[PDB]
Write an enzyme that holds these catalytic residues in place. Structure first.
Site, PDB file in Angstrom:
ATOM      1  N   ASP A  23       0.833  -1.253   0.000  1.00  0.00           N
ATOM      2  CA  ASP A  23       0.000   0.000   0.000  1.00  0.00           C
ATOM      3  C   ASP A  23       0.832   1.251   0.000  1.00  0.00           C
ATOM      4  O   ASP A  23       0.609   2.142  -0.716  1.00  0.00           O
ATOM      5  CB  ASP A  23      -0.968   0.047   1.187  1.00  0.00           C
ATOM      6  CG  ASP A  23      -2.388  -0.573   0.880  1.00  0.00           C
ATOM      7  OD1 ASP A  23      -2.534  -1.682   0.338  1.00  0.00           O
ATOM      8  OD2 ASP A  23      -3.404   0.052   1.218  1.00  0.00           O
TER       9      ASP A  23
ATOM     10  N   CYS B  54      -1.264  -0.248 -15.518  1.00  0.00           N
ATOM     11  CA  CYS B  54      -0.855   0.909 -14.734  1.00  0.00           C
ATOM     12  C   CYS B  54      -1.975   1.970 -14.529  1.00  0.00           C
ATOM     13  O   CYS B  54      -2.434   2.677 -15.426  1.00  0.00           O
ATOM     14  CB  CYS B  54       0.311   1.560 -15.377  1.00  0.00           C
ATOM     15  SG  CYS B  54       1.021   2.711 -14.261  1.00  0.00           S
ATOM     16  N   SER B  55      -2.261   2.220 -13.273  1.00  0.00           N
ATOM     17  CA  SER B  55      -3.352   3.022 -12.925  1.00  0.00           C
ATOM     18  C   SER B  55      -2.906   4.130 -12.091  1.00  0.00           C
ATOM     19  O   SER B  55      -2.773   3.903 -10.885  1.00  0.00           O
ATOM     20  CB  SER B  55      -4.342   2.107 -12.138  1.00  0.00           C
ATOM     21  OG  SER B  55      -4.366   2.327 -10.740  1.00  0.00           O
ATOM     22  N   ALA B  56      -2.661   5.278 -12.742  1.00  0.00           N
ATOM     23  CA  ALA B  56      -2.284   6.519 -12.039  1.00  0.00           C
ATOM     24  C   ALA B  56      -1.552   6.458 -10.653  1.00  0.00           C
ATOM     25  O   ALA B  56      -0.366   6.041 -10.497  1.00  0.00           O
ATOM     26  CB  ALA B  56      -3.517   7.388 -11.915  1.00  0.00           C
ATOM     27  N   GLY B  57      -2.290   6.941  -9.696  1.00  0.00           N
ATOM     28  CA  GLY B  57      -1.820   7.060  -8.361  1.00  0.00           C
ATOM     29  C   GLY B  57      -1.005   5.967  -7.822  1.00  0.00           C
ATOM     30  O   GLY B  57      -0.427   6.124  -6.798  1.00  0.00           O
ATOM     31  N   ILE B  58      -0.898   4.969  -8.698  1.00  0.00           N
ATOM     32  CA  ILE B  58      -0.216   3.697  -8.499  1.00  0.00           C
ATOM     33  C   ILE B  58       0.105   3.090  -9.913  1.00  0.00           C
ATOM     34  O   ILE B  58      -0.723   2.415 -10.494  1.00  0.00           O
ATOM     35  CB  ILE B  58      -1.154   2.841  -7.629  1.00  0.00           C
ATOM     36  CG1 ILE B  58      -1.524   3.649  -6.407  1.00  0.00           C
ATOM     37  CG2 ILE B  58      -0.592   1.477  -7.331  1.00  0.00           C
ATOM     38  CD1 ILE B  58      -2.003   2.884  -5.196  1.00  0.00           C
ATOM     39  N   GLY B  59       1.291   3.437 -10.440  1.00  0.00           N
ATOM     40  CA  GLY B  59       1.749   3.069 -11.807  1.00  0.00           C
ATOM     41  C   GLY B  59       3.090   2.373 -11.943  1.00  0.00           C
ATOM     42  O   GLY B  59       4.053   2.763 -12.609  1.00  0.00           O
ATOM     43  N   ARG B  60       2.995   1.210 -11.349  1.00  0.00           N
ATOM     44  CA  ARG B  60       3.999   0.228 -11.220  1.00  0.00           C
ATOM     45  C   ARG B  60       4.452  -0.431 -12.467  1.00  0.00           C
ATOM     46  O   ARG B  60       5.601  -0.836 -12.520  1.00  0.00           O
ATOM     47  CB  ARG B  60       3.480  -0.835 -10.250  1.00  0.00           C
ATOM     48  CG  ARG B  60       2.905  -0.189  -9.042  1.00  0.00           C
ATOM     49  CD  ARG B  60       2.502  -1.138  -7.978  1.00  0.00           C
ATOM     50  NE  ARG B  60       2.024  -0.296  -6.919  1.00  0.00           N
ATOM     51  CZ  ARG B  60       1.637  -0.667  -5.709  1.00  0.00           C
ATOM     52  NH1 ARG B  60       1.586  -1.952  -5.342  1.00  0.00           N
ATOM     53  NH2 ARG B  60       1.284   0.291  -4.868  1.00  0.00           N
ATOM     54  N   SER B  61       3.585  -0.536 -13.438  1.00  0.00           N
ATOM     55  CA  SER B  61       3.909  -1.242 -14.624  1.00  0.00           C
ATOM     56  C   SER B  61       5.058  -0.733 -15.355  1.00  0.00           C
ATOM     57  O   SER B  61       5.728  -1.483 -15.907  1.00  0.00           O
ATOM     58  CB  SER B  61       2.715  -1.379 -15.563  1.00  0.00           C
ATOM     59  OG  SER B  61       1.996  -0.202 -15.752  1.00  0.00           O
TER      60      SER B  61
ATOM     61  N   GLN C  14       6.225   6.349 -11.537  1.00  0.00           N
ATOM     62  CA  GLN C  14       5.630   7.470 -10.883  1.00  0.00           C
ATOM     63  C   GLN C  14       6.311   8.272  -9.819  1.00  0.00           C
ATOM     64  O   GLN C  14       5.843   9.320  -9.574  1.00  0.00           O
ATOM     65  CB  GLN C  14       4.194   7.141 -10.500  1.00  0.00           C
ATOM     66  CG  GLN C  14       3.260   7.364 -11.639  1.00  0.00           C
ATOM     67  CD  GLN C  14       2.130   8.263 -11.265  1.00  0.00           C
ATOM     68  OE1 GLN C  14       1.215   7.848 -10.576  1.00  0.00           O
ATOM     69  NE2 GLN C  14       2.205   9.524 -11.682  1.00  0.00           N
TER      70      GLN C  14
END
Ligand SMILES: Cc1nc(-c2ccc(C(=O)O)s2)cs1
Length: 283
Positions: A181, A215-222, A262
């Site tokens: 998280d 990858c989804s914004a506030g969390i863009g790990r990819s 990010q």
């Protein structure tokens, strides 16, 4: 290991944010006329990034070809990847039409469905064998075939049908389930364990279409998954492996999709991932 001296330099000097902003400053900015238009505004996870127009994946529909996804093509490494936003409830059908039309074999998912108390995507795959999904809007069936639940990730076999004509294909869903998280994982070992398992599936290989990753914004790990894969590959390709410069590779990827990687923790982690990995690749 040079990357490693530069890595260690940086550490001792507390320069992550400062190197990070530098890359941000020299990044690529390209137009994204399409994402931003009225009709296709329901199609974007908010807060989310925008696909550049030169690189966007076109849907084969004759009325709204729009999807929040991009093609990252790495000429030297001979790798291509499609990066996209976690689907929304209104775009689940889109997501699977993209996967079909683009001949992908694997889907990689680097987040949980719900994180930090909120939905980070729509539950886009069937939870059980006996209960398959139908996306009437794009005419497609999705059935869970098998599930393999392990300590840090989970792998699934899926069967996707194109109801117009009867073809079926296996798609493999690789899910990394233990990204914390807050922050980044202490050691990259499980992360690298995970990347090779995907490699082993054949989902990144040139005999299949590009791998779809979310990858989804506030969390863009990819961004990190791709950055890491590309550098390792190049380390196996060139004559002078110490000439791989992750910064340069990154900027290169950035010509295709905005904001990949990010944060300064995420850049640091990316160096970590690679250094190890290279080290493991030496034996
Ligand atoms: C054969 C392989 N070599 C590497 C590297 C060797 C040396 C590096 C360095 O010293 O920078 S990277 C990764 S895989």
């Amino acid at each position: 290991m040079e990357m490693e001296k530069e890595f260690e330099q940086i550490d001792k000097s507390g320069s992550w944010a400062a190197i990070y902003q530098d890359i941000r400053h020299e990044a690529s900015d390209f137009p994204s006329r399409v994402a931003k238009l009225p009709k296709n505004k329901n199609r974007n996870r908010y807060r989310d990034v925008s696909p550049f127009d030169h690189s966007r994946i076109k849907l084969h529909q004759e009325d709204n070809d729009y999807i929040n996804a991009s093609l990252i093509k790495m000429e030297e490494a001979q790798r291509s990847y499609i990066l996209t936003q976690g689907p929304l409830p209104n775009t689940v059908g889109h997501f699977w039409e993209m996967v079909w039309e683009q001949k992908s074999r694997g889907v990689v998912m680097l987040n949980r469905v719900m994180e930090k108390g909120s939905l980070k995507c729509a539950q886009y795959w069937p939870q059980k064998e006996e209960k398959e999904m139908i996306f009437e809007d794009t005419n497609l069936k999705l059935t869970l075939i098998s599930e393999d639940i392990k300590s840090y990730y989970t792998v699934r076999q899926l069967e996707l049908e194109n109801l117009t004509t009867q073809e079926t294909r296996e798609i493999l869903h690789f899910h990394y389930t233990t990204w914390p998280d807050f922050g980044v994982p202490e050691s990259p070992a499980s992360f690298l364990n995970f990347l090779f398992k995907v490699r082993e599936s054949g989902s990144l290989s040139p005999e299949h279409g590009p791998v779809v990753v979310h990858c989804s914004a506030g969390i863009g790990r990819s961004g990190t998954f791709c950055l890491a894969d590309t550098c390792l590959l190049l380390m196996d390709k060139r004559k002078d492996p110490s000439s791989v410069d992750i910064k340069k590779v990154l900027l290169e990827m950035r010509k295709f999709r905005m904001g990949l990687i990010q944060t300064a923790d995420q850049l640091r982690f990316s160096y970590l991932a690679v250094i190890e990995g290279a080290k493991f690749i030496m034996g």
